[PDB]
Each structure stands twice: as C-alpha cells, then as structure tokens.
Amino acid sequence: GYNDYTQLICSYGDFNMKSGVYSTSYYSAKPVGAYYEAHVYPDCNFTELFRERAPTIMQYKREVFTRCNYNLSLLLSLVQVDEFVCDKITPEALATGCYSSLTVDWFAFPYAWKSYLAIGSADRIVRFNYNQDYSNPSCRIHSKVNSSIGISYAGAYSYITNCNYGATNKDDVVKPGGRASQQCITGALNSPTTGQLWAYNFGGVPYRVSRLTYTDHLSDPLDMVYVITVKYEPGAETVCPKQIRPDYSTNITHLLGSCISYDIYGITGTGVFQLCNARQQKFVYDKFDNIIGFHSDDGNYYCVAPCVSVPVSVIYDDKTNQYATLFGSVACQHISTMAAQFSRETRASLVSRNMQNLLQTSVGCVMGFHETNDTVEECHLSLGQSLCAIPPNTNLRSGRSTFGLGSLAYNSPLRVDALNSSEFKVSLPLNFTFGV
Amino acid sequence: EPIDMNKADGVIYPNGRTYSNITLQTTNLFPKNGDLGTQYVYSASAFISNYSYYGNPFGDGIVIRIGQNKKIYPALMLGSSFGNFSANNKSGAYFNHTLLILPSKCGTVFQVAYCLLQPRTESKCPGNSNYVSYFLADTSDEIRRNGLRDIRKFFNLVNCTYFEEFNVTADERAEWFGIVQDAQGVHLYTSRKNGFNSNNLFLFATVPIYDKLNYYTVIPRSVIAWAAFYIYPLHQLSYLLNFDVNGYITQAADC
Amino acid sequence: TQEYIETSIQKITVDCKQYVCNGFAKCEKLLEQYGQFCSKINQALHGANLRQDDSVRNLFESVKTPQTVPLTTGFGGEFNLTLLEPLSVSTGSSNARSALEELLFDSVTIADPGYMQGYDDCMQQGPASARDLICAQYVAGYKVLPPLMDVNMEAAYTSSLLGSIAGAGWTAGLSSFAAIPFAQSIFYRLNGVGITQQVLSENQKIIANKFNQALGAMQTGFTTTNEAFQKVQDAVNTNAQALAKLASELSNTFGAISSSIGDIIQRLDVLEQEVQIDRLINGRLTTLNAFVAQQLVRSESAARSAQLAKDKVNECVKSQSTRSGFCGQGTHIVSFVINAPNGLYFMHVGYHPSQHIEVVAAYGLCDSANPTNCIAPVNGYFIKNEWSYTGSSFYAPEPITTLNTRYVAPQVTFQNISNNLPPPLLS
Amino acid sequence: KLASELSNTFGAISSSIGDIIQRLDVLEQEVQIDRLINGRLTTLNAFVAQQLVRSESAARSAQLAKDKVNECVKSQSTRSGFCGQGTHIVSFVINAPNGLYFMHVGYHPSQHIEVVAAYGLCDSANPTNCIAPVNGYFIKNEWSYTGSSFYAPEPITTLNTRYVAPQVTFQNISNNLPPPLLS
Amino acid sequence: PLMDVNMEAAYTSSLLGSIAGAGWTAGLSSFAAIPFAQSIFYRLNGVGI
Amino acid sequence: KLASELSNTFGAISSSIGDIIQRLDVLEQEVQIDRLINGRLTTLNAFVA
Ligand SMILES: *[C@@H]1O[C@H](CO)[C@@H](O[C@@H]2O[C@H](CO)[C@@H](O)[C@H](O)[C@H]2NC(C)=O)[C@H](O)[C@H]1NC(C)=O
Ligand SMILES: *[C@@H]1O[C@H](CO)[C@@H](O[C@@H]2O[C@H](CO)[C@@H](O)[C@H](O)[C@H]2NC(C)=O)[C@H](O)[C@H]1NC(C)=O
Ligand SMILES: *[C@@H]1O[C@H](CO)[C@@H](O[C@@H]2O[C@H](CO)[C@@H](O)[C@H](O)[C@H]2NC(C)=O)[C@H](O)[C@H]1NC(C)=O
Ligand SMILES: *[C@@H]1O[C@H](CO)[C@@H](O[C@@H]2O[C@H](CO)[C@@H](O)[C@H](O)[C@H]2NC(C)=O)[C@H](O)[C@H]1NC(C)=O
Ligand SMILES: *[C@@H]1O[C@H](CO)[C@@H](O[C@@H]2O[C@H](CO)[C@@H](O)[C@H](O)[C@H]2NC(C)=O)[C@H](O)[C@H]1NC(C)=O
Ligand SMILES: *[C@@H]1O[C@H](CO)[C@@H](O[C@@H]2O[C@H](CO)[C@@H](O)[C@H](O)[C@H]2NC(C)=O)[C@H](O)[C@H]1NC(C)=O
Ligand SMILES: CCCCC/C=C\C/C=C\CCCCCCCC(=O)O
Ligand SMILES: *[C@@H]1O[C@H](CO)[C@@H](O)[C@H](O)[C@H]1NC(C)=O
Ligand SMILES: *[C@@H]1O[C@H](CO)[C@@H](O)[C@H](O)[C@H]1NC(C)=O
Ligand SMILES: *[C@@H]1O[C@H](CO)[C@@H](O)[C@H](O)[C@H]1NC(C)=O
Ligand SMILES: *[C@@H]1O[C@H](CO)[C@@H](O)[C@H](O)[C@H]1NC(C)=O
Ligand SMILES: *[C@@H]1O[C@H](CO)[C@@H](O)[C@H](O)[C@H]1NC(C)=O
Ligand SMILES: *[C@@H]1O[C@H](CO)[C@@H](O)[C@H](O)[C@H]1NC(C)=O
Ligand SMILES: *[C@@H]1O[C@H](CO)[C@@H](O)[C@H](O)[C@H]1NC(C)=O
Ligand SMILES: *[C@@H]1O[C@H](CO)[C@@H](O)[C@H](O)[C@H]1NC(C)=O
Ligand SMILES: *[C@@H]1O[C@H](CO)[C@@H](O)[C@H](O)[C@H]1NC(C)=O
C-alpha cells in the first residue's frame, strides 16, 4: 500500500520478479466515513407481552410486528433471562438491523421443563401444543418476569397430552409454526384436569382429548417463554431499531467519492458513492444481484460501486527497477475523484494534481508515461491494442523516470510493382546468408 | 376459462425485490396449468344459487379471476370449521372465528372482518327452520357498509378482533385476487397495481389470523349471466418465470 | 469451402483478494488458512495470458510475407477480388479491414467491452442484460485484457498476405518473388492439375465467370445455414459463458446464511461467523480453481488450433496444396484468409466436376515394328476414339504430341498400334 | 503444489492430526479431521487433473516432434515455414530436458534486385516450338537464364529449359535465337 | 525417465550420422554414404542455385 | 466413477437423504444434507471437466 510497486510485490508473493505488465490488488483501501439512512416509524407496542395475563401453552398468543421501531434495551430490563437458544441470529444481532416482519410467540411455561421444548424432543408438548418453525432465524428465550412489571397468572394453565380422531385413531399433531386445532381445544376445555381421555364428537367425527395442568408450577417470578422469529426480505424492510448506529452520519454529500461503510436499511457493506443522473424501487440491482445504485430520501440518485473497482495494472522492468501504472478502461478525468482508494504515493500524486502524470490511451489512463513516436519490434511490456511500453534507461536510484508510450510498428515488406503486361518483374537475391 | 401460463395467469409476484429481464426458477404456491377452476355466477334478473352449502377446502390458498378474460365482485366467507346449522339440518354454518370479505357499495368499498357468526332467531334467518340461504342484496355515505348491513341481518357478529376497509376505483377490465395463509397470518393479493398489462398478484394487506383456515364459501349475491368469477386452487409447484423489461412476469412454465 | 480456426483464448485477470473477500479483514485473516492462494491464482493467470500472447506473436510471425505487390483497384482482372481487397484501396476510409471482414464482424454479436472508457460507460448507463457481463468486471473483480494487436495491424498482415498470393510458389525455393498477375497464376494453377493450355485459352471467360460466382456467393453465406459461421458464434458464446461463470457465483450462499460477508458478520457471533465465512471462502476458492483449470484446458486447445492455422496458412494460402482433403474438397486452386473474432477464417476454392463421362483408356502405346519404343502420357490418359490425349481433369480429345508424352520401358499391358502412329512413335 | 498444501489447516484448528486428536473431544475432532481430509483430497484431485491435461499436451508435442524429425532432420523439407523461415537447407536435433531441441539452417537473401522476366520464349519462324525455364527465369539483359535463388545470368541451354505448348504471353524473338530454339 | 542420457545421446548421434544420406534418391530402402559437403551442395542446387 | 461415488457418505452420518431426514432434527438435516450435496456436485463437476 505504499507504492504500486509494493502492491505488485505483495501480490504474486515474491521480491525478485521478471519484467512485464501485471494485474495488481489493492492494499490501501479502508472505509473512512460511515453512512446510515433508515425510515422512522411509530414505536412497537409490547404491552401485551409483559403487562397482561400470561397465556397458556395450549392456546399461546402470537403477535406479528410490522412497520414499527423497537427498542431491545428496554425489553431486556423487564425480564431476567435464564437461557436463550437462538438458531441463525444472536440477541446482539436482534438489537440491530431491519426486518420485514417480527413474530413473537409467548406463553407461560415452567423453567424445569426446558427439555420439553428443545429441538428433537418426542414429548407430548411439542407434539400437541407448540411446534417451533425453525425455517426462519428464530431465538427462544426463557425468562422470569416480575409481578411488579404487570404480568399475572390466573385460571388454569393446561397442555394437551393426547388428541386423536377418527376410527383409526390418527394423532392430531401440530405443524411447525402452528397451534392446536379448535377441535382439540374444545375437547380439552371440557376434559378433566387429572388427565382422563374423554370422548367427544365435533362435526360428525369422533375426537378424543386429554390434558394436564401445570398451574401449580408457577410462582411470583413467573417463568415465561418468548419465541422471536424474524424474516429477511431485502427491499421490504420495515422493523428497525429506534437507536441510530453511533458512528454514522446521516448526510452523504460530504462522503461522496470516499470508501465508506453504509447501513442503509438494515444491510451492511462498504463502497464508494457517487452522484449520477439515472423509480419503481429504491435499490437498483444488476443481473447478478449486486446493488449498483439507490434512491435517497431527497431528490438524488447515488450509484454505488465496491470499495475497489478500478482495474490497476503495473508496468515493471526488472532491470533499472522502474515502474508505471495503468488504470484500465477509465478516463483520466475520473481518477482524481477516486484517489483515496489507491496506494499512498499514488494518492499523494493525484491529490495536489500534476496533469503531466495522466495520459489517455486506447487501453485506459496511464501514469508515469510520456508520449513518444519510437517503435520497438520486441514487445515485453505489452499494454494491448498494439501498444508497448518503452522502459527508461535510468535506474531507480537516480530518481523515477517516465516510460515511453506507443510502439509496435509494422514490418512493411518490400514492394514489387506489377508491370501488368506480357512480361513481369522478379525480385532476385544478389547476396545470401544462413540463419539458424 | 383455464389457467394459461403464457399469459402468466394467477402467478404471485415474489415479495421484496423487483426483478427485471431475468428468468427465475422458484418453487412456491402457484396455480396448476390447465385448471378450469369452479365457475360462480351471480344473477341480475332475489335469485341466488346454493353457493352457501358447499364448504370448499381451502388448501394452501386460492386465486380468483374476476370479471372478463358487468364485473361483479365476489363475496367470501373463510373459516376453520364447517358444519350444519342447528334445528334445520342446513349446511353453511361456520364455527369459531370466521373471516368475511364483503363487497359493499357497487364493488368499490370492501369490508374485511374476522369474527364469530351467531345465527339470529327470526323468520328466514339461520336456526329458525324457515332457513333457505343467506345472501347479500344490492351519494351520501351510509351505503359504504351496506354489505355489512346485509350480512348482520343473518348473523350477530358479536366479538370482532380485526376490521378494515379498502377503497377500490370502479373499472371493467380483468382483475385477480388471491388469499394465502402462512405463519405470519393471512395474505391478500391483488393485481390493482394497474401498471402496463399487470395481471400479476402483489401483496397489499395482511390479516392477523393465526388459526388455520380450512374452508371457504362463496356468499351468494343478487343485483336488482352478468357475473362470472373462477376460483382456482394453489399448489406447491415448481415454476419458471420470465420477467420483462418493465419488471413484470410475462411467461411462466409449470415444470 | 469455409473453415474457421480459433487461435486464441480470452485473456482474463482476476483480483483474487477482492473476489474471495469483499474488503473484510476477518475474511482476509481466515483466507490465510488456505495458504498463498491469491498469489498462485495471479501467477497462473499471468502465465496463461503471457503464453497466449506469445502464441499470437508466433502465429503472426508465420504470416511474415517478405515481399508483396501493392494492392490496386484492378486485382485479378476478370477475376473479381474486390470482396477480399482492403477497404482503403477501395472506396472511402483508410482502414485495412476488407468488406468481407466488416461483414463477418458486423453479423456476429460480440458485445464489445470498450477498453478506453468502459468504466465510465458502465457508470453512466443503467442496468441492462446485454452489457451486464461487461459491467460485472468492475463489480465482481475481474478484467478482460485487450488483444496484443489492433485490428488495423491484423488487417495489414492479411492484406500483405493477399498481395503476395499470386507471386509466391512460382518456382523452386522461396527466395525469389515474381510479380505475375492473379489471372496468370490462376491459369497456371489450373494447368498444373491437368487442364490443357488449349482448353484454358478457349474457355477463359467461362472460368472467370465461374470463379466470380463462387466468390460472390459469399454475400449471403453468413447466415444460420453456414457451419463455420456457427463455429464463430459458439466460440464467442463459450467465452461469454466462461465469463458469466466467473460472475453469478458471489450470489451463492454455499450453505451459509447469506452470500455476503457483512450480513454474516452482523447476524452471528464471533465463533459461528468463522465457519460461515469459511463456507463462503471455500465456495469462492472452488469457483476460482475451476476457472483457472478451464483456462489451462482452453489454452491447450488454442495452441493446437494455432499450430493447425499455421500450417493452413503456410500450406494452402501461400502455395497450392496437392495433398488431398487438407484444404476443402475437390482439387485445391487458391485459398484466402481473413481475420475472424478470436481466430482466422479460411476460404478454399475447389475444382469440382459437375458431369462425368466414361471412356476406355490405355496404360501406354508401343510400336509393332519397334516394340522397344513405347510412350506413356503425362498428366493425362490415352483415350480411344485411334488414340488421342486427354487432360485427366477435363474431357478434351487432343492429338498426341511429344509435349504430353514420355518414353518409358515396354510393358505387357501396353497396346500395340500399326497404322496412324503418333509422331512420338514415328521412326 | 503438493508439499505446500500439507501445511494448510483448511479451516481446522491445526495443520496436523496429532494435535487435533489431543486438543479436542472425540466428537469434535471428527469434523476437523474430515476438513483436513477434504482439503488434501481436493489437492490430490487437482494434481491428478493437471497431470492428465499436461500429458495430453505432451502427447500433442510428441506427435509434432515425430512429424518434424521424419520431415526435416531426416529429409529435405520443401515445405514453407514448417521448419524455419526462408528455404530449409538442413536441420539438426539434440536432446533437451524433457524434450528435443531443433536447429533449422535456412537460406536467407540479404540484398534484392528487380529484373524483367518472361513466361517463355518462342521462335517467330516456328511458332509451335516454345520453351520455358525449369528452376529459374528468362531474364532480359538479349535473354539469359538465371537461378531462382541467386542472381547469376547464364546462356540458355537445353539442360535448364523444356519444350512447352505455345501461348500468347510468350515473347517473340527473331533476331538472336538461343540454342534450344535454333532449328 | 526410462532412458539414460547415454542412450538418448546414442540415438541422436546415430541420427546425425545419417543426415547426408537417407533421401538421396526416391525410396527409403537404400542408404548412400555421401559426404556432408556434397549433400549440402546438392540441396542448394535443388533449392535453385 | 459416477456409479460408485453415490455410495459415499462424504462425512455425513449416511449416504441416503432419507436416513438423514429420519434420524436428525431439522437444524442438523440441512447441515448433513449439504455434506452430501457438496460431494455430489464435486463428482459431477469432475466428470464434466
Ligand atoms: C399498547 O397496547 C395496550 C393494550 O394492547 C394499549 O392499552 C390500551 O389503551 C387504550 C387507549 O390508550 C385503552 O382504551 C385500553 O383500555 C388499553 N388497554 C390495556 C389492556 O391497557 C396501549 O395504549 C398501547 N400503546 C400505545 C402507545 O398505543
Ligand atoms: C431504549 O430503552 C432504554 C431503557 O428504557 C432507554 O434508556 C433510558 O433513557 C432515558 C432517557 O434519558 C433515561 O432516563 C433512562 O434512565 C434510560 N434507562 C436505561 C435502563 O438506561 C433508551 O433511551 C431507549 N432508547 C430510545 C431511542 O429511546
Ligand atoms: C369453537 O366453536 C364451538 C362451537 O361453536 C365451541 O363449542 C361450544 O362451547 C360452548 C361453551 O362451553 C358450549 O356451550 C357449546 O355447547 C359448544 N358447542 C358445541 C357445538 O360443542 C367452542 O367453545 C369454540 N372454541 C373456542 C371458542 O375456543
Ligand atoms: C366474547 O368476549 C368476551 C370477553 O372475553 C367473552 O366473555 C368471557 O367469557 C369467558 C367464558 O364464559 C369468561 O370466563 C370470561 O370471564 C368472560 N370475560 C368477560 C370480560 O366477560 C365472551 O364469552 C365472548 N363471547 C363468545 C360468544 O365467545
Ligand atoms: C503388345 O505387344 C507386346 C509385344 O511387343 C506384347 O507383350 C508380350 O506378351 C507376351 C505374351 O506371351 C510375352 O511373352 C512378351 O514377353 C511380351 N513382351 C513385352 C515386351 O512385354 C503385349 O502383350 C501386346 N499387348 C497386348 C494388349 O496384347
Ligand atoms: C509471339 O508470337 C505468337 C504467334 O504469333 C503470338 O500469339 C498470337 O498473339 C496474337 C496477339 O498477341 C493473338 O491474336 C493470337 O491468337 C496468338 N496466336 C496464338 C496461336 O496463340 C504471341 O502473342 C507472341 N508474343 C507476344 C508477347 O506478343
Ligand atoms: C427408546 C426406547 C427404548 C429405551 C428405553 C430406555 C430408557 C428410556 C427412558 C427415557 C426415554 C427418553 C428418550 C428421550 C429422552 C428425551 C425425551 C424428550 O424430552 O424428547
Ligand atoms: C419485584 O419487584 C419488587 C418490588 O420492588 C421487588 O421487591 C422484588 O425484588 C422484585 N423481584 C425480583 C426477582 O427482583
Ligand atoms: C448535507 O450537507 C450539505 C453540504 O452543503 C448541505 O447542503 C445539506 O443541506 C445537508 N443535508 C442535510 C443536513 O440533510
Ligand atoms: C447529467 O447530464 C448532464 C447533461 O444534460 C451533464 O451535464 C451532467 O454532468 C450529468 N450528470 C452526471 C452526474 O453525470
Ligand atoms: C510525434 O509525431 C507527431 C505527429 O505529427 C508530431 O506532432 C510530434 O511532434 C512527434 N513527436 C516527437 C517527439 O517528435
Ligand atoms: C346445489 O344445487 C345443485 C343443482 O341441482 C345440486 O346438484 C347440488 O347437489 C346442490 N348442492 C347442495 C344442496 O349442497
Ligand atoms: C349435516 O347433516 C347431514 C344430514 O342431515 C349429514 O349427512 C352431515 O354429515 C352433517 N354435517 C356435519 C358436518 O355434521
Ligand atoms: C337435524 O338432524 C338431527 C340429527 O338426526 C335431527 O335430530 C333433527 O331433528 C334435524 N332437524 C330437522 C329440522 O329435521
Ligand atoms: C376510503 O375512502 C373514504 C371516503 O373517501 C375515506 O374516508 C377513507 O379514509 C378511505 N380509506 C382509506 C384506507 O384510504
Ligand atoms: C431486456 O432483454 C431484452 C432481450 O433481448 C433486450 O432486448 C432488452 O434490451 C433488455 N432491456 C434492458 C433494459 O436490459
């Protein structure tokens, strides 16, 4: 990241290399600023979760949150977490980032029965009462809620132990992300507490249901289970935290042209933003799913590139140790805006600009060259399109020297004119030589 | 009026990103090609069919082709349990919470409600043994909820959790509508985005229904053929989708 | 006969560190668990591109043509070669690409990247479906290198080869160069394969017309019914397919929770993101290694085809080839070569007999009074109805002279004639 | 590319099995050892594929060397550009590491001149008696024969001409006749 | 590599010993012990000098 | 090669998708099935090359 020569040396993994034109990776591009743009929505309302009667696991309560801004720092102070089991997320990841939906399923459940909700369990509680989805990033937490928060437990807290129907006694299991059917609920709500399999007939089909209660396993620090499932759908993000990220700036006009880390609508990445002229959507994608632009809140369209995007080639000769840069397929009037992304000496050359450096060729903008008319037959420093680089005759210890540009003349063979008559012309050798 | 994949009939647009000029292979809820659906006709000469006796299975979801290939909107009743009414043996009773989609006014205002349907003990009402059927019968803003007025003469609607209203502008062209239930609730899809040919279903509402819907009935209507809408089921099918320049699905392949 | 030979592979350099990791330090630290991968990929791609340019330089060294006749509007005389001649010597611009080269390039969908201001264009225009492969160079992290020689220089080499076709191969050795006209070279080539000078002088306008129709039938020859045109198109499509395989692989999660490092870092703790980034890194390394292996195989194929094109040029364009089937069907007369996308396009004209007749011929003729004096024909037969001479490539019964016979040893199979002796057999 | 990727961990905690075994429990070391096995298996498969493609290229080059030995070092080539530029005179082959080294000696002109030549000469008294050069040209001074690879005019004799059918392009000569054309 | 440099050099030397012959006249069955200078002069004569 | 590399477990508990689905829970099914998928993709890619 000091020179283009040092970036050429760090790639290819050696110091003593031969002459040639090499493709060079970047080593001095770091994110400087930070940008954050997200929509503001009215706050999510979590009163039903913590300030009402605790739901029963047989008929648990589900609430789906959409187009609201939450605050996890307040929610975690009202509970004492005993154990959290997250699938493809973390609570630190739940405190950040935008979702399309936020589903919370909560019910009252004793803390001694964690094994009955673990994945792979074969008990009646998973089979007939609550089956977790496990197809979206979800985290199930076990918490104790104080009675001073507003939670309460009353009535009977029961769970279905068996629910089968029909003449073949087919078990009415619970699909993942589902609840017990209304037939099982109606059979349970008349079923005895002790756990006797009574028989009923709902809608012409025999049904049998048994239940058991756990209302005597609940105390004043009421044990509660909160299952939080999020969904990710880019271009449809609605639930984001009230807290804006701390470093970030909310104005992009002073960060244009520099590699910044952006958190625009729950997605994180690094890139360079530049204003460009070219709306059924906010983000703009290419054919290969790479965001190439976005529409801002004001009237402006910033097309975003990756942090490194300009192809850089280094022309180097092992004798005299000189080097030069080739910015491939890019105009010379655009390099001075993207400078911060190059090496330190190249950045120091483009800032405080001297236009002697930048020459525009048919293969891109070159640096460290001078225009010449001399042509060479051998081409060891080919730039393509019949251009060869003529290395200087001064070594690097005496100071940097410029390369020569434009070479590869035609052989121009000897011309014999046709008489176009009865006779013709022949080109015969007077002298000869032997070549091997 | 069968499903045609080359016209992309009944395909649901993927939620979120707008795809453009690429082909996409998805396996998601889609109408099966060649399905004729079930034709429902509202008379206009009051005069109804027995559409309230069926209790068709909901399955994964349904899609509806409304109007041309008079444009009278459908009325729907979705629920979890289906059975007979008491003391008359007549089918059509929906137990527990029941989703109602009622096209009030002339099809310009919609009522969506999710609540119990308690029969009334009056003559020609359910539970009276004079029962035949329930139906919806068709300036200042009091008939904006007249479909609700017709449906509350037969049922009490006593404990109601969700209620919303939607404004749609009057038109006569083709239109689609779809209902899909997942773990986030009941998703209502429509093709009212009206961009270019359209005929693609986009999400526009979500009802917080967490009980599994197992049945749907078509509420009979009478205005005093003149009405034809076809209800096609949805299946978990592999499809191949073609997006055009504007970003709409033009071709489909049933795979 | 039209034949396409693909003498090259696209030169592609890939920024390995940017491709595998999107600038994240954690990914670049986890990449060190797979060794110096990026250095090896960079060295392999550099070696492949350097060998490709060396092959191109050697192939065009075999088109040296040390002497040439300058091209003029009148070339071939009655024979029409304005299709093959440079556009500079024809009407208009000083470019050397012939009308056939322009017609061949204009009828093949190339989607030129633009080596001067490709970045800037890709920035100004929005998303598309025809230039998105070109615009993926600056997003995915690769680059398509320009060819070693400009199209003007390749057209200059082809034009200099065209001007040297008639004179080369006139006599023994390659040292001299005659400046004979194209029509005389064609007539001598037709005479060498067994057509009498009497037939050539009598039927010269018919021969010129047949050659003109054969060369002018290629105006509509660049259609979907032409096999070599489809070879050009599918070579271009194969290069585009390899490029599209380089992209569209960063969109693959490879079993991770997302296709991007930033989401994995944000959504997971510090221990699980190591294995997720390892999954993504393994996917990217598999893609890069597959691309490099494919590049090596295509380089081997391009080297083989470059050797084949060198013989085709040295054997058929620069001289008449008497070996069967090497350059087209029938009897080879003259072959032309132009520049095709990533290769060379060859056109071999051939002598095809439209009609055949059957006639009794003899091995040779002896004398009854002098059985040790026998003759055999050169480049022809001794056809009956006594015996006359034919050309062995065109039916024209002509009197036997010493200009078409040779004195050979007597054989049992030779026929004996007593009256109406040929002038070779007299005395 | 075989001894270098034995030092890679391939995502495991170590590049060796001996310390993976002794640092982890029996269930947790199976995945680490399997990661090392997968990495070394991909390395070996890549090496075998590279060996196959290199053997294909070596077979192609062996066929080329077989054809080139039988044509140029064992005989006069008389083929343009196949065995060096210019006209091929003599070639030699010596052994090189993993192949053969060829040296093709060729005849190269250094200075050229342009003279006026004829397709052949005929006699005006006998139009049916016409000659042509065999390995050279009829260059004009009246007319002389020369070689096709060296400029040295010589008198026209019967050992460098051959009788041909008359044509229109043949120059008429009636003042001085070459010995083939004289009667 | 299956062969010692001695053997390979023996093959190359034997090939060098038969440069002047083995192609003096049509057919490959005969061999002429022609001096190298005479073979070179005959090859130059066949080239067109 | 194609016939025989379908019997390999590739580090999974089984060489069959059905046994992995039956024996393990849904979180581990996607982990172990991806081990079979990756091996079969490797086999097909090697065959095509
Ligand atoms: C959050 O939800 C609770 C209950 O769901 C809301 O509390 C209700 O508020 C209305 C009017 O504010 C009262 O009429 C009800 O009696 C309240 N019910 C209960 C159970 O408290 C609360 O208002 C909501 N928060 C916000 C900000 O809207
Ligand atoms: C998110 O919730 C936390 C906790 O309720 C808020 O932190 C409180 O902020 C107020 C305002 O100064 C203080 O008076 C409290 O003492 C804070 N409580 C704690 C526990 O720190 C925080 O402000 C909320 N975030 C937002 C954006 O409102
Ligand atoms: C679902 O609906 C059924 C039928 O409407 C309800 O069952 C009724 O429950 C009440 C309360 O005990 C009884 O008086 C009725 O006799 C029952 N009817 C039948 C047909 O059994 C059931 O309670 C509902 N489920 C709920 C509300 O969760
Ligand atoms: C309509 O909702 C009310 C409110 O929940 C229900 O009244 C409850 O009924 C249950 C069962 O009889 C009692 O245990 C509760 O104490 C009642 N609560 C109140 C506030 O009265 C009523 O049953 C519902 N009606 C129907 C038909 O389901
Ligand atoms: C043409 O005449 C020659 C004789 O000059 C015939 O050749 C002879 O055939 C006899 C057959 O018994 C042999 O014994 C002689 O040795 C042959 N002589 C020569 C010189 O070949 C020849 O067969 C005759 N041609 C035909 C077609 O009959
Ligand atoms: C050499 O003489 C011959 C015989 O006169 C010429 O051949 C004739 O040329 C004229 C015109 O050039 C033609 O009209 C005749 O048809 C030719 N006769 C034959 C039999 O071909 C020949 O052209 C003369 N050479 C030159 C260079 O003029
Ligand atoms: C497998 C039956 C044969 C072996 C029987 C021997 C001992 C059985 C005792 C308890 C069986 C429990 C097995 C699963 C334990 C977790 C149950 C759950 O919470 O999911
Ligand atoms: C619940 O709140 C009361 C009221 O201050 C407090 O005394 C008690 O300690 C709290 N419970 C717990 C577990 O902290
Ligand atoms: C961002 O900064 C620019 C700098 O001139 C200013 O004009 C603009 O109003 C700012 N936008 C804000 C603060 O939203
Ligand atoms: C937008 O287009 C105008 C031409 O009308 C041009 O002057 C301007 O520079 C363009 N803006 C950008 C960001 O390229
Ligand atoms: C190179 O050639 C151009 C062509 O006109 C000329 O203008 C220029 O001065 C030349 N440069 C040098 C250094 O001679
Ligand atoms: C509805 O009416 C049709 C018409 O006769 C009849 O076939 C069908 O059985 C009826 N369905 C009922 C009564 O459920
Ligand atoms: C409704 O009643 C009919 C006959 O009266 C019976 O066949 C049918 O099963 C009943 N339906 C239900 C759901 O009980
Ligand atoms: C409805 O069916 C039940 C079941 O048989 C019967 O008891 C009842 O009388 C029927 N109602 C009428 C009105 O017939
Ligand atoms: C529907 O239209 C009525 C009448 O203009 C209006 O009062 C109501 O707010 C509208 N509803 C929505 C959701 O826009
Ligand atoms: C969309 O794809 C078609 C396919 O030919 C193409 O013609 C058209 O230009 C593309 N449009 C865009 C905006 O990429």
Author numbering:
A (entry chain B): 343 to 620, 624 to 781
B (entry chain C): 50 to 94, 103 to 126, 143 to 211, 219 to 304, 312 to 342
C (entry chain C): 782 to 1166, 1174 to 1215
D (entry chain B): 1026 to 1166, 1174 to 1215
E (entry chain B): 928 to 976
F (entry chain A): 1026 to 1074
Paper text:
Merbecoviruses from bats, pangolins, and hedgehogs pose significant zoonotic threats, with a limited understanding of receptor binding by their spike (S) proteins. Spike (S) protein is the major viral surface glycoprotein of MERS-CoV and forms homotrimers. For the MERS-CoV S-trimer, NTD is known to mediate cell adsorption by binding sialic acid, while RBD is known to bind the human dipeptidyl peptidase 4 (hDPP4) as the entry receptor. The S2 subunit mediates membrane fusion and exhibits a higher level of sequence conservation among CoVs.
In addition, S-trimer structures of six merbecoviruses from different animal species were determined. All locked-1 merbecovirus S-trimers we determined are found to bind fatty acids in their RBDs, while fatty acids were also identified within RBDs of locked-2 SA-BatCoV S-trimer (right). In the locked-2 SA-BatCoV S-trimer, the modeled LAs were bound in a different conformation. Although the locked-2 S-trimers of CN-HedgehogCoV and SA-BatCoV are similar in overall S conformation, no fatty acid was identified bound in the RBDs of the locked-2 CN-HedgehogCoV S-trimer (right). In the characterized merbecovirus S-trimer structures, the putative LA carboxylate group interacts with a serine from a neighboring RBD via hydrogen bonds. In contrast, S-proteins of CN-HedgehogCoV, EU-HedgehogCoV, and SA-BatCoV are unlikely to bind sialic acid due to changes in key sialic acid–binding residues. Recent reports suggest that SA-BatCoV, MOW-BatCoV, and HKU5-BatCoV bind to ACE2 using different binding modes. RBD alignment showed that HKU5-BatCoV and SA-BatCoV also differ in Loop7, η3-β8, and Loop10 regions, while the sequence of MOW-BatCoV showed insertions in the Loop7 and Loop10.
